[PDB]
Design an enzyme around this catalytic site. Structure first.
Site, PDB file in Angstrom:
ATOM      1  N   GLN A  23       1.134  -5.965  -1.991  1.00  0.00           N
ATOM      2  CA  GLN A  23       1.951  -6.273  -0.824  1.00  0.00           C
ATOM      3  C   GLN A  23       1.216  -7.071   0.235  1.00  0.00           C
ATOM      4  OE1 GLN A  23       1.145  -4.678   2.199  1.00  0.00           O
ATOM      5  NE2 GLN A  23       2.968  -4.854   3.497  1.00  0.00           N
ATOM      6  N   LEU A  61       5.399  -2.941  -6.644  1.00  0.00           N
ATOM      7  CA  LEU A  61       4.216  -3.677  -6.199  1.00  0.00           C
ATOM      8  C   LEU A  61       3.700  -3.024  -4.921  1.00  0.00           C
ATOM      9  CD1 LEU A  61       5.945  -6.230  -7.817  1.00  0.00           C
ATOM     10  CD2 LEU A  61       3.829  -7.291  -7.109  1.00  0.00           C
ATOM     11  N   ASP A  62       2.595  -2.294  -5.050  1.00  0.00           N
ATOM     12  CA  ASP A  62       2.140  -1.372  -4.017  1.00  0.00           C
ATOM     13  C   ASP A  62       1.436  -2.130  -2.891  1.00  0.00           C
ATOM     14  OD1 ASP A  62       1.321   0.976  -2.624  1.00  0.00           O
ATOM     15  OD2 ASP A  62       1.318   2.079  -4.524  1.00  0.00           O
ATOM     16  N   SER A  63       0.723  -1.383  -2.041  1.00  0.00           N
ATOM     17  CA  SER A  63       0.076  -1.944  -0.859  1.00  0.00           C
ATOM     18  C   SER A  63      -0.842  -3.117  -1.190  1.00  0.00           C
ATOM     19  CB  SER A  63      -0.703  -0.841  -0.139  1.00  0.00           C
ATOM     20  OG  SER A  63      -1.211   0.110  -1.059  1.00  0.00           O
TER      21      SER A  63
END
Ligand SMILES: CCCCCCCCCCCCCCCCCC(=O)OC[C@H](COP(=O)([O-])OCC[N+](C)(C)C)OC(=O)CCCCCCCCCCCCCCCCC
Ligand SMILES: CCCCCCCCCCCCCCCCCC(=O)OC[C@H](COP(=O)(O)OCCN)OC(=O)CCCCCCCCCCCCCCCCC
Ligand SMILES: CCCCCCCCCCC[C@H](O)CC(=O)SCCNC(=O)CCNC(=O)[C@H](O)C(C)(C)COP(=O)(O)O
Lengths: 172, 606, 459, 86, 156, 173, 128
Positions: free
Chosen positions: D45, D40-42
């Site tokens: 996030q 779960l990327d930026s």
């Protein structure tokens, strides 16, 4: 430095739902909205040449600003809130410890003894922390507001005193 | 004669005692908050003894215990206007202060300046009740700034906050704007009526007090936070919730309007002078209540519904009703103290949170404060057999059947509906709604002292006027029979004030994106009034204080004309007359023409 | 009245022959003693002045000034304790001599019974202050500071001298009592209006007047700490005390051509107060606020209403004190930081709480909060002005707009707020600063209870 | 406000990650770094950052809000922000 | 440490002194825009955009967060004009012109519409207050020694 | 009553006679009874202490009187000896005249409060008597300024005097 | 569409609304490095002297005393008597004065038109 799409749309998504939670108040409504902006935010994460990627971004900010909650929610302890800079009135520097009166110095002897060795490690490690920092400093001074560590042996991480001796966030 | 004066004069004396112990530091730190609590408490219980004299005898009397000096025909003396207005205001005032400062010590408990705070509250009463006891207008002015500069100090309880320091600036500024008319009234009174005593001012029967009442009306605009000088209460809320509850709920804001009701013998003499009172009061009620219609806090709504109320007592004197205004402020303090009291309880129980949109389910988790908030809103929203009945029901009916402008009426019904409106808007967001506080559960009220302080003022919030309704003599001219539709309008305007909030509360229940609109923002940012008044005029005037003041005139112009130019002239033609070539020929050549001009041109011989 | 004059004259052998260590200990211990001796002059009759001798006399107007000057003299002593400790002993004795000689000329000036005797001792005071301002000053411009001081004051002083001798040759005496009893109406001839111009512009210059005020910002700011208080506290007020004295023969032309001055004071008082709120130097604030209050008393004398003369005396002493604590306070931040920029040092109560307590009560004293005699004197000016013109209030009411707009402004940026974490120079408060603070402000609340003596001769 | 401890305040946040139905209860780790250790990327996030902030009270500054990304490096900051030595 | 160069001198006419004055205020060469030079007295000082101290980043590690200052970086001529306590130059959600329209549009309505009610007030259809003893004029201040014509009434 | 009613007239004392037809014990009366016994009596004995100790020595003061001097009217022009007395005499009369409007003001002040709302007619003579005091006070002193003088007072008195004297001649018609 | 925000002297246009700040260009990206470096050294020469135990005095800011000299001293050495400066001085100096003169001279004589043939009220004005 300069801001790129990732840094900026992360900035966008912070404020956007901060307005949304303040708009909806009750969790569940904003809950359905916040997770659907998420899909609405990934509904186009494949755009072609960066000009459109910027142009759609321009459309994001404008609707954000007029979709910005005019009275948004701000946590008090953070800038803009009730508790922002509230305890700075109780904030007091550490050098007032030095000019303590000798009769009062003997009323807190252990705490003044600990400050003696704390300022001791300040002095015996200041000169080594700085000399190492200048030699490892690239020419033209620092190229950014970074700080080198105590990478070598028997040293303190340069420019540590004030930030180690920063007053506590609740000086009370 | 033997009793009455000496008892209340002791009250002024006895709570000054905490102050000069505080300067002598005879207090042992934590003892002082309870120490002053006790002294104020007896200051209450003793104050009823002069009160009991008024219910039975009804007599009043003025004391002149000292004479300051005699300005020829004006002998300034320490004169106290001790009367029904004076004596009965005492017990309600400081009991409210005694009630709140208990909630303060529970709330204000961590900052190591407890004593410094508590004395700051102590001298605050000293300046208050001397205004209501003062007879010479100079003594009233002494207390007028006395609360004003001390609100500055009290709201500036935390110097870390720069908004607090910012808030004090307009608070003093708007207060200073008010007391200009106080000076104007003083100037008019000292020239025309050449007196300072309130008793002397009225008894001269100055039936044309145009300039004075203009000044007193201006004085109220600052102290009582009328239109124009309203937003200082929206600024003063930054000061701690207790002291904000103590000062800026109903205790010192009413001093400004109480000034007019003090001047009632001459306040209503000019029919025209009454008129713009209804004008100034009406616009507050529309504006302030509009602001409270949407407010994401628990402090602004109370303050606006006050300033809306402060826009009503002087409406009654605007229709020649002094005492109806006077009883209004008494109940005003009775419930408005609580609304801030319980609100501050939320801020303490739920960790430093004020906005409506951060907490829910406060009914079950906060029962007593829920009950206190229910009755406090119930008291203010005109309900029979409470504060609203003898005051809010009475005023609404009174302005309704008395001679008044149509819009002066119209705002009262609208504002009273709005008071009934946003009172339920915060009640909903308080209790009705699922919890909106951080998972860490810490909300509590088990502290008996907070619980005690609430119930000591509970008896006021439900009983209020009834304890003194038949006790006080009737100064109001009744109407008895009158048409029934506008007599019940107060009870009418409450009901659609409710469900309109209820359905909008259910819009926050309704799962749907509510579009932003100008009306919501207009209410929240005070109609965008501080966005300009706190920004536009002060920027222009003080920028002029940068260029037109120093750079243009002082540092350059006045320094160019006389000093620089004249010094230049000395410097400029010095070298034309001092520096000379030095060759001998020209010097005696100069001697030549000197002979003729002496001999021929002016011809000193002739 | 040589009860006070001679012991001050003798004080010069005293300090000069004192030992190395005491000197200042000697200087204070006897200057306080002279102060209560001068406190005797509080004995006034109703209206007949205290005529001690042929050349010396005092009244209800002069006496508050005498007590102000005599009691002031110890204060700059202790105030100068810190600033001048490093200097050798001989100049130390010389500096005290300048202070004593200055107070010496002040007390005779206020108490002269002949106008020219007042004049000779009026401008005799610039000679020591020129020494004080120029020699013992701190910043570079102090050189030009002295030139601005004397030349401004003298530029009006000489016209007074020519006028004074003219009255001598015309009436036969310049003595206050004779000129008061034989006062004659000053006609409206062009010769007489210039005579009025001569007998007024001298005091107007060191009043100051709007436009004729540059010396105080260029002198008080760069004057030595002791020198700075003395200029604003009393050396402002020779023109005032003279002004109520010479205004006994200038009637009726005063009521006809005081309008340009009443103009320039009223706009100036708002103008000076507004610019006071917009300086980066705190020392300039007390200087600019001083004239703002000082511009008020010129209004008092011009209308010459009894009520105006009431507050002229009270505000004179009130402001004369008021500038004193602020200059003392503004000094205390300076040597600690070696700068007079309010921006550099903010929120000092987090480091110096007691200093802050003194700072705010001096500030609210400047606010003219009753019952303090600052307000009651200032208020009487408002009432007299309203009697003169009802409209007057708005322009001066604008002065009750700017004063507190700045008079609490440095508080919230010098004593109030947060602290910059880089100044470790700030230390505890030496008891001298608070002690002199006590003798500075405690009086003003004391005689506040009893305002009649410092009210003035119009009682 | 209690004498808040890092151990108590992190166990609050490890709940949020296990209350993150996307962040599986077995996928919980004190060093669950979202874009590469979790995926779960930026973007996936920053909303969690507000989620913890909504339940923490404090607002972590944006310069490190997007950056402090592994649960221990976040809980290091509430240790810094509250400045408690436990 | 500070001899002569740091203080503003003349207006940097030429590009050479333009760059020197840019270095003087330790700014870059290209972003240096000195104040307009027309009887203004500012000279070396550069134009500073209207950015108040409240508007600056409150999350930045300012050396002086009182007004969000740092060390050494240039300072606005009207810095004290726009500081956090004083006037602020910060973005608002909705246009300043809009305030001007509502603020004018809002306030203008009442004194207009309240002027209308100055001719049209509200009351109850109830007659005057007929009063005994010549309408209080015996004891309503008015002198009764002069003939106080008795205005008496009857129950209609 | 160290004063006297001829200079300080006060309304007569008329008090009602309560008839408590009710049954509840009147708390107000009991508060007085405890107050005189607990508060008055001890401080009264202290007051009775200060009486006879003040009585064991009673030094007397007497009034300060001034012989009336020849006025500025008979004071010779530009003379400085007898100008002194007449200028002194006028200024005492100035201070005297302030204290009598003060006395009428104090009489005015007491008249309203002690007579309640009835003061509108109860001070009718009290109101009227001030006006003749004030208007005549203005004729004595008005527009004299801070530097008032006996000569300037007579100049104003003269200025009014021929104006009305000429008006009286004009009024003869 | 929707209401549109506008820049102002105090209600300045936000960076978010202005598309100019969004115009990513090599000149701006390369420019930011210099400000980053100059602020870095300023932070460096702030911290070392501040964190130095030997620095018992006050660390002055060169920008601070440049401003103080500028705001007060540099005005007249750089001042030039342009026509607009005279006009502004006229309308902020002598100009406002004449405003007070005309208004104050008028009512004063307007009062003097009242007293002489008795049309002013002096019933209580005995404290001249
Ligand atoms: C007896 C005395 C009168 C008769 C004898 C003198 C006769 C000649 C008078 C004029 C002499 C020459 C004047 C020279 C001059 O103005 O130079 C330009 C002068 C000097 O300019 P400057 O050289 O200072 O200009 C540079 C300024 N800085 C340093 C900041 C860069 O101009 C000015 O001073 C400004 C314009 C004139 C301002 C004064 C006019 C009004 C005076 C008001 C007070 C009146 C009393
Ligand atoms: C008899 C009745 C007379 C008329 C009564 C009118 C007012 C009735 C009560 C209104 C209560 C409004 C309310 O609930 O306020 C709080 C609420 C908070 O809304 P929120 O959950 O934050 O979501 C929207 C914002 N994003 O706010 C909202 O949701 C917005 C509601 C707007 C209410 C505006 C009230 C203005 C009324 C006076 C107008 C005067 C105009 C002149
Ligand atoms: C109240 C609600 C207001 C708001 C809603 C309502 C108003 C705005 C409506 C329009 C919203 C708009 O479509 C989306 C916006 O907010 S912004 C732009 C997102 N698109 C890009 O920037 C393209 C490039 N893509 C990337 O940079 C990466 O894909 C990313 C960082 C996104 C994820 O990276 P991954 O995590 O590694």
């Amino acid at each position: 430095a300069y801001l790129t799409h990732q840094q900026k749309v992360l900035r966008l998504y912070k404020r956007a739902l901060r307005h949304l939670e303040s708009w909806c108040v009750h969790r569940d409504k904003y809950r359905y909205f916040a997770c659907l902006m998420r899909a609405r935010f990934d509904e186009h994460k494949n755009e072609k040449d960066m000009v459109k990627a910027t142009q759609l971004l321009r459309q994001a900010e404008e609707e954000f600003w007029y979709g910005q909650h005019p009275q948004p929610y701000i946590f008090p302890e953070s800038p803009g809130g009730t508790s922002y800079e509230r305890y700075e009135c109780y904030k007091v520097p550490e050098w007032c410890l030095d000019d303590w009166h000798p009769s009062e110095k003997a009323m807190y002897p252990d705490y003044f003894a600990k400050r003696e060795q704390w300022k001791r490690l300040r002095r015996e490690s200041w000169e080594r922390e700085v000399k190492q920092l200048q030699e490892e400093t690239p020419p033209g001074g620092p190229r950014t507001e970074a700080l080198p560590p105590a990478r070598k042996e028997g040293d303190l991480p340069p420019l540590w005193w004030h930030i180690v001796t920063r007053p506590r966030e609740r000086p009370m | 004669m033997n009793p009455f004066a000496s008892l209340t004069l002791t009250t002024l004396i006895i709570l000054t005692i905490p102050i000069m112990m505080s300067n002598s530091n005879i207090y042992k730190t934590n003892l002082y908050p309870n120490y002053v609590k006790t002294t104020v408490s007896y200051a209450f219980t003793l104050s009823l003894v002069p009160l009991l004299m008024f219910m039975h005898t009804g007599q009043e009397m003025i004391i002149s215990n000292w004479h300051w000096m005699t300005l020829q025909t004006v002998e300034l003396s320490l004169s106290f206007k001790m009367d029904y207005f004076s004596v009965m205001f005492i017990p309600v005032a400081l009991f409210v202060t005694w009630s709140i400062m208990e909630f303060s010590m529970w709330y204000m408990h961590s900052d190591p300046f407890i004593n410094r705070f508590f004395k700051y509250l102590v001298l605050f009463l000293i300046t208050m009740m001397i205004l209501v006891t003062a007879n010479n207008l100079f003594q009233l002015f002494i207390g007028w700034e006395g609360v004003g500069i001390m609100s500055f100090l009290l709201i500036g309880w935390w110097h870390g906050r720069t908004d607090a320091n910012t808030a004090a600036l307009q608070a003093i500024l708007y207060n200073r704007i008010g007391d200009i008319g106080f000076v104007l009234s003083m100037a008019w009174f000292l020239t025309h009526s050449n007196a300072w005593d309130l008793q002397q001012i009225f008894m001269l029967n100055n039936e044309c007090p145009n300039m004075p009442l203009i000044g007193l009306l201006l004085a109220a605009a600052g102290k009582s936070a009328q239109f124009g000088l309203h937003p200082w209460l929206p600024s003063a809320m930054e000061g701690p919730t207790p002291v904000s509850a103590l000062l800026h709920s109903s205790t010192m804001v009413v001093a400004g309007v109480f000034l007019l009701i003090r001047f009632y013998p001459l306040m209503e003499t000019n029919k025209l002078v009454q008129t713009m009172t209804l004008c100034l009061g009406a616009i507050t009620t529309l504006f302030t209540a509009l602001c409270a219609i949407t407010q994401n806090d628990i402090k602004k709504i109370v303050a606006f519904s006050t300033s809306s109320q402060l826009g009503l007592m002087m409406v009654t004197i605007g229709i020649n009703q002094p005492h109806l205004a006077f009883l209004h402020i008494c109940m005003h303090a009775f419930f408005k103290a609580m609304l801030f009291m319980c609100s501050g309880s939320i801020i303490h129980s739920l960790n430093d949170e004020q906005d409506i949109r951060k907490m829910g389910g406060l009914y079950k988790a906060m029962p007593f404060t829920t009950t206190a908030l229910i009755i406090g809103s119930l008291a203010l929203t005109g309900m029979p057999y409470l504060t609203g009945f003898y005051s809010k029901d009475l005023i609404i009916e009174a302005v309704n059947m008395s001679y008044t402008n149509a819009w002066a009426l119209l705002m009262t019904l609208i504002a009273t509906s709005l008071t009934a409106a946003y009172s339920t808007r915060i009640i909903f967001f308080a209790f009705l709604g699922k919890p909106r506080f951080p998972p860490l559960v810490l909300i509590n009220e088990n502290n008996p002292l907070l619980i005690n302080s609430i119930k000591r003022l509970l008896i006021g919030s439900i009983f209020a006027g009834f304890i003194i309704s038949n006790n006080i003599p009737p100064m109001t001219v009744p109407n008895t029979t009158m048409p029934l539709y506008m007599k019940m309008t107060a009870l009418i305007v409450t009901i659609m004030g409710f469900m309109l909030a209820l359905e909008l509360n259910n819009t926050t229940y309704y799962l749907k994106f509510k579009y932003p609109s100008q009306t919501y923002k207009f209410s929240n940012m005070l109609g965008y009034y501080p966005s300009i008044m706190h920004r536009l005029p002060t920027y222009h005037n003080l920028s002029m204080s940068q260029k037109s003041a120093s750079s243009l005139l002082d540092l350059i112009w006045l320094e160019t004309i006389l000093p620089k130019t004249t010094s230049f002239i000395q410097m400029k033609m010095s070298i034309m007359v001092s520096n000379q070539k030095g060759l001998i020929k020209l010097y005696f050549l100069s001697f030549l023409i000197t002979i003729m001009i002496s001999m021929t041109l002016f011809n000193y011989h002739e | 009245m040589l009860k006070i004059i001679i012991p001050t004259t003798m004080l010069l052998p005293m300090t000069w022959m004192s030992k190395h260590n005491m000197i200042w200990i000697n200087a204070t211990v006897h200057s306080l003693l002279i102060s209560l001796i001068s406190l005797s002059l509080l004995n006034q009759l109703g209206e007949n002045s205290l005529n001690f001798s042929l050349t010396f006399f005092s009244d209800s107007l002069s006496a508050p000034l005498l007590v102000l000057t005599t009691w002031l003299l110890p204060l700059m002593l202790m105030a100068s304790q810190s600033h001048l400790s490093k200097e050798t002993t001989t100049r130390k004795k010389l500096y005290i001599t300048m202070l004593i000689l200055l107070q010496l000329f002040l007390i005779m000036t206020f108490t002269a019974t002949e106008l020219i005797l007042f004049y000779i001792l009026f401008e005799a005071t610039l000679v020591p202050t020129l020494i004080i301002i120029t020699r013992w000053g701190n910043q570079t411009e102090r050189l030009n500071a002295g030139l601005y001081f004397l030349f401004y004051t003298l530029a009006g002083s000489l016209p007074l001298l020519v006028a004074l001798v003219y009255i001598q040759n015309t009436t036969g005496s310049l003595n206050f009592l004779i000129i008061h009893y034989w006062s004659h109406p000053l006609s409206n001839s062009w010769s007489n209006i210039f005579m009025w111009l001569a007998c007024i512009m001298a005091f107007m210059v060191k009043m100051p007047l709007y436009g004729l005020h540059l010396w105080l910002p260029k002198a008080h700011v760069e004057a030595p700490i002791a020198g700075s208080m003395v200029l604003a506290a009393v050396l402002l007020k020779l023109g005032g005390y003279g002004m109520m004295r010479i205004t006994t023969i200038l009637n009726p032309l005063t009521n006809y051509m005081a309008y340009p001055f009443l103009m320039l004071s009223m706009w100036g008082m708002i103008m000076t107060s507004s610019i006071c709120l917009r300086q980066t130097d705190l020392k300039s604030l007390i200087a600019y606020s001083s004239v703002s209050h000082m511009a008020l008393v010129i209004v008092a004398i011009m209308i010459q209403t009894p009520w105006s003369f009431m507050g002229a005396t009270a505000l004179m002493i009130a402001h004369g004190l008021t500038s004193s604590m602020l200059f003392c306070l503004a000094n205390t931040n300076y040597e600690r930081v070696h700068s007079r920029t309010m921006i550099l040092a903010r929120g000092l109560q987090t480091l110096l709480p007691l200093m802050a307590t003194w700072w705010l009560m001096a500030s609210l004293t400047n606010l003219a909060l009753p019952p303090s005699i600052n307000l009651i004197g200032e208020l009487f000016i408002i009432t007299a002005s309203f009697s003169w013109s009802n409209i007057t209030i708005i322009l001066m009411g604008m002065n009750m707009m700017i004063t507190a707009l700045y008079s609490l402004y440095m508080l919230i940026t010098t004593q109030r707020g947060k602290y910059t974490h880089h100044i470790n120079n700030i230390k505890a408060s030496f008891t001298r600063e608070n002690a002199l603070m006590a003798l500075h402000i405690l009086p003003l609340l004391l005689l506040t209870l009893n305002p009649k003596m410092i009210l003035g001769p119009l009682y | 406000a209690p004498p808040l401890t890092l151990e108590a305040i992190k166990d609050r946040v490890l709940y949020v990650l296990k209350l993150y139905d996307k962040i599986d209860p077995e996928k919980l780790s004190v060093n669950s770094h979202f874009m590469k250790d979790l995926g779960l990327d930026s973007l996936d996030q920053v909303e969690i950052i507000m989620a913890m902030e909504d339940e923490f009270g404090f607002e972590i500054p944006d310069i490190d809000a997007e950056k402090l990304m592994c649960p221990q490096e976040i809980v290091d900051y509430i240790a810094d922000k509250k400045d408690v030595y436990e | 440490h500070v001899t002569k160069d740091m203080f503003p001198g003349p207006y940097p006419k030429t590009p050479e002194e333009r760059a020197a004055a840019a270095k003087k205020y330790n700014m870059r060469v290209e972003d240096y825009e000195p104040y307009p030079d027309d009887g203004m007295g500012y000279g070396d000082y550069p134009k500073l955009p209207d950015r108040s101290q409240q508007e600056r980043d409150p999350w930045y590690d300012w050396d002086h967060p009182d007004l969000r200052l740092n060390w050494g970086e240039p300072i606005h001529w009207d810095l004290d004009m726009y500081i956090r306590n004083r006037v602020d130059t910060s973005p608002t959600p909705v246009s300043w012109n809009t305030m001007c329209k509502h603020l004018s549009g809002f306030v203008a309505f009442m004194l207009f519409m309240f002027w209308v009610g100055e001719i049209y007030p509200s009351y109850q259809p109830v007659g005057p207050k007929q009063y005994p003893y010549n309408d209080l004029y015996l004891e309503r201040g008015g002198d009764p020694t002069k003939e106080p014509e008795p205005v008496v009434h009857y129950e209609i | 009553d160290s004063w006297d009613k001829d200079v300080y007239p006060e309304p007569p004392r008329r008090t009602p006679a309560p008839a408590p037809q009710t049954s509840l014990p009147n708390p107000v009366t009991y508060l007085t009874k405890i107050f005189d016994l607990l508060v008055d009596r001890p401080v009264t004995l202290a007051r009775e202490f200060i009486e006879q100790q003040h009585a064991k020595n009673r030094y007397y003061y007497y009034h300060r009187e001034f012989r009336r001097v020849p006025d500025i009217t008979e004071c010779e022009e530009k003379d400085i000896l007898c100008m002194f007395e007449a200028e002194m005499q006028w200024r005492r009369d100035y201070k005297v005249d302030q204290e009598i409007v003060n006395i009428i003001q104090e009489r005015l002040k007491a008249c309203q409060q002690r007579e309640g709302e009835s003061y509108r007619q109860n001070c009718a003579k009290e109101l009227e008597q001030f006006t003749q005091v004030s208007k005549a006070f203005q004729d004595r002193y008005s527009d004299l300024g801070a530097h008032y003088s006996a000569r300037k007072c007579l100049a104003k008195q003269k200025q009014r005097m021929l104006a009305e004297r000429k008006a009286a001649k004009e009024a003869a018609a | 569409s929707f209401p549109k925000y506008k820049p102002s002297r105090l209600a300045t246009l936000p960076a978010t609304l202005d598309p100019a700040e969004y115009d990513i260009s090599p000149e701006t990206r390369k420019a930011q490095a210099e400000r980053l470096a100059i602020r870095s050294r300023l932070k460096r020469e702030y911290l070392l002297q501040y964190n130095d135990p030997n620095r018992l005095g006050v660390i002055e800011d060169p920008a601070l005393i440049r401003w103080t000299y500028a705001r007060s001293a540099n005005i007249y050495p750089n001042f030039r008597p342009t026509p607009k400066t005279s006009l502004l001085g006229a309308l902020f100096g002598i100009g406002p004065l004449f405003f007070w003169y005309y208004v104050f001279k008028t009512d004063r004589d307007k009062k003097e038109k009242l007293i002489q043939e008795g049309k002013l009220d002096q019933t209580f004005n005995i404290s001249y």
